[PDB]
Amino acid sequence: MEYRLKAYYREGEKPSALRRAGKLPGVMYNRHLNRKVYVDLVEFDKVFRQASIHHVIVLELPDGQSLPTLVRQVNLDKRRRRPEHVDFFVLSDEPVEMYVPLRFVGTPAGVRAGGVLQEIHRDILVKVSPRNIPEFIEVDVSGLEIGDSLHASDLKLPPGVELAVSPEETIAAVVPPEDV
Amino acid sequence: VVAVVKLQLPAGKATPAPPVGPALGQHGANIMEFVKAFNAATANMGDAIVPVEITIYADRSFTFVTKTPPASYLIRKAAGLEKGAHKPGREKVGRITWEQVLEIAKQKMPDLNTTDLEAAARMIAGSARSMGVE
Amino acid sequence: RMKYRKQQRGRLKGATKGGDYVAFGDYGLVALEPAWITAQQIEAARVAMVRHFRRGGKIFIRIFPDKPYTKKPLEVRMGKGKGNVEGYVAVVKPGRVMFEVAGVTEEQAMEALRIAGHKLPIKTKIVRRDAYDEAQ
């Protein structure tokens, strides 16, 4: 949830001058419903860190207009961190770009005894879920032991009805620290 | 003199050479060898830390009728806790149900301040620290 | 050390700007002032990390050595053409992000990074999963 003061400009000196003002340039775009819109940083940046945000739907309010959207991109700087350019994707009827955080809440078996580490792999996924998006998919496992890594098949999908991914694919892993 | 100081020891034994040593004559105690009396008195009651404050006094105080055992290990004694003798006490020796542990507080709550209402899981729940069963 | 089966043995020398970005376990370092970085510096690095994380904590490596390095003689007058090798630098232009989780909790990641990246030529900054990224 935030807003997003609109700006006419396209490409030139302006985005740079605005960054000098602290103000992300950005995009409002959806199935060729287009506009170029220019966010201010700071609070919209806390918003940006709010985790569900850049994932779960976020609303924004160009002048007084309201739109829902979920970020499709953030161009980073390379010379340093800090985002350079946000890209929105407003949601009409069906969204499919679904970038879902996982919450595996593993039952103990490996990290504690064998010392093996449950390395996160894909962290977050690409599924399909029109305006009813499930939050934290929760796939507990006691297979922490043995050095197995349960794949993408095992998620057992909650009503966000689709695996876009090719099924079964090391979604979450354990790696031995020194093999047991 | 006035060696009536406070010096706890281990319940139920005989020769107190590892605990006494400088905790008796050193300060100004007297005699020795109420070893037998330590047996004759405390070899019986409370395997839950039953030491008698060696009240330093002329002729060297005697044993029998200590004060009390205290500690959680009296307030919940029915167990032992040998565990950890090697390692940091993994598991085991931790259950005769919650329940025999509670019924053991019906008489395992001897002398203490004025007197609080409970000596079970309102203090055995401090043995929650003391033992292995938090 | 590593770099086996190079197909040449005399690369030139360029460097100026580029990079990568994300953490891959989520406490990684990231260089600022850009430089060569030879393998020796890496053995020193991952060792400082290892020995600080209970000699087995999980360190994804990161960058990797490639371009050959050489002085050529001993002090012999230059003239002959360019040969030999002993350095084997990777190049790290700014923003390259070394990848170093260890599930090792909070500060130890930080501190092991302090040592480790301080066992290296270039000033560096400590970061983790944050401004994020996604595509397909």
Place this chain on the structure above:
Amino acid sequence: YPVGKLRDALEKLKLNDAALTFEPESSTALGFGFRCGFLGLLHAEIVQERLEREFGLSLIATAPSVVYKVRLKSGEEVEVHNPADLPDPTRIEEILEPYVKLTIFTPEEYVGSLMQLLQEKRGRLVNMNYLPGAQKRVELVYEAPFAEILYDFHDRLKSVSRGYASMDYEQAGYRPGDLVKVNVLVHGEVVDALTFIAHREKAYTMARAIVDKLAEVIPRQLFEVPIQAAIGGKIIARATVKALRKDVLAKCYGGDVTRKKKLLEKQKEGKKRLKAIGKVEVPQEAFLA
């Protein structure tokens, strides 16, 4: 320790005072009896200095020796041990040492500071009974090794307890305990080896000492021989003597890194060729004793 001349009027009896004679150790300088060091730290120094600037000549000052009653399989136990009779462990087990239990009368709290010192050779308590009469003084009994109590026990014990109470051994009941062996492998031909006992692994603090003797002016042109402390396992210490060499590349002061390269092989290849003929013969000259 005499350096040399034996007997020479074994001035032992002299006049009262815990005299001593005979019973001398060998190892690498016999020196006959090694006594003459009873009472305090004075009687020893005094007597040693007496015959020194009075009658005796340039004498030694070695430390004390041991025995080690090993137990070689198929019977052994004793077998008369000598600072050289090291028959490895082929004698089955060890079990050799004099674990004497003395009775220290440390009062006040000299125990705390002393109890730690008594650990000179892994000691233990036997009967800790609070002395009677009143207080102040105290008692103490351990099972240290007569080998780790002989030298350096009083001068150090008196300082830990301000120099109170006393101490007396019992020399009763043997014992095994770790011993080990330590031999200084000079150059690479191995000589004397000196060694010690390695009992409980002590050569360490002694290995990097006896070996790293800096080499008694043993350079030999440019032998560069490395003096390592060969006790009983690969290598413990590592004392290498410096060679000599010659300012060979000191006349071609010019150019070309090739010229200064030739006058380097003759010195490098030669130094090695020598590492064959002679080794090292530096025993006398006041051993690192």
Place this chain on the structure above:
Amino acid sequence: IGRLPIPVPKGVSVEVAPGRVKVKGPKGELEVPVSPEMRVVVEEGVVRVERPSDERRHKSLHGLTRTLIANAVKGVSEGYSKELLIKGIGYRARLVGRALELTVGFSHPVVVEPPEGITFEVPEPTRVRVSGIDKQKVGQVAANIRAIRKPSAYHEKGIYYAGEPVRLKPGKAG
């Protein structure tokens, strides 16, 4: 906050002067130099020091001012003084007249005169405390006489202030 309210009861004769405020008590006229931009005024017993502005300088100096003048009034109020405590048998001390005996350099003409408003109370060589007036020259003196043999990082032996328990290091052994 706590940077302005000074109580000066008693019967003081404090008065301001161009950056050189003054105090007149029972026997002192103890001076109180200050920086003019802070500036102070006093009435009855209330004492009204003031802060020109809040760059760190003026505030910090402000605190000086309140402290220094406070030390003036408390100082002349009695004739302020510092406790002292020689210990460890290597000593003697005596008032002598207008310098101290002392005895600890063993070749010990360790003479030492009072400078000014100072005078030496010689009560027991195990005490010997010194009168003065202004606290800071009291300190200059306590430092001077304490300047000769105070530490003994092994066994106690020397001059001491009121007295630490006195940190030690273990002696030759034990």
Place this chain on the structure above:
Amino acid sequence: KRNVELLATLKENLERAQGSFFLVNYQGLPAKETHALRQALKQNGARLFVAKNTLIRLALKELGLPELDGLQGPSAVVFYEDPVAAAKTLVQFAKSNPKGIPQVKSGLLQGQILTAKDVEALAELPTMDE
């Protein structure tokens, strides 16, 4: 959070369930030394909260909520906040009266109370041990 939320809330919660609250200056003894009297009514009966040890400002404005209409016979300075109300006060009070009076040098001077309905007198509380 900062305000009435951490204990403060329940502070006058259960205490309000009664109608004869009390207060004392008890504290100034070593933890064990008055631990010995840290169970008076708790021995005389059960479930006492004697020596609750909140005080002024912490409860001095929170006393108005309590509707004792003025327990301010002890609110200033040290204040044990020991409720005579938790017990049905009578014979039990002596077990807390001897406990704070007989003990030590200045074992535990009382502030006052709200014993019964009307506030207990500063002397009468001292006067009526039972």
Place this chain on the structure above:
Amino acid sequence: MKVRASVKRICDKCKVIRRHGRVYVICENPKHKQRQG
């Protein structure tokens, strides 16, 4: 005990101090008297 750089605080009770362009770290324990200047 000049260490003229570093100066990392270790007695942990340790005080840090600038003074006359220096950075002494004074501690109640004598060992820690580091001084980058």
Place this chain on the structure above:
RNA sequence: GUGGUAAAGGAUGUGGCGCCGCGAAGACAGCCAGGAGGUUGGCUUAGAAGCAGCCAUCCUUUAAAGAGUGCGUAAUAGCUC
């Protein structure tokens, strides 16, 4: 006296920044006094009856609860918060 010549480095330098600290049911440093009773063993009980030494994650007072950080040692003992 930086300016009027140098880096990794360290730095409650100093000015200003955007978050983070109010608990007037009143924090902060100083304090004043109390820092807990069963809260005391697993092994070492040579001591762990915390802060020798290889786990102790819940109740008592609730001021809060130190499963207990710190001196220290035979532990303890008496000592910060």
Place this chain on the structure above:
RNA sequence: AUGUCGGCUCGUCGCAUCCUGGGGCUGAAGAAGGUCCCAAGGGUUGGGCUGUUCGCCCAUUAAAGCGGCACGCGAGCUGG
């Protein structure tokens, strides 16, 4: 035409001090130390060997410094 090693004779200079001073810390009791800091005013010998600077080696001593200065100094020497 910029006479090149070494020695003599004369030097002066700096400090990254060998001694002499002044001080921290210690696994410093004292003494002897260790080790870093401030310290350039003075002092840093006599020999054997070799062309030798260098180096070991005798005798010591407070010590027996490291360097500059066209590897200081030949319109001043010697020339091994």
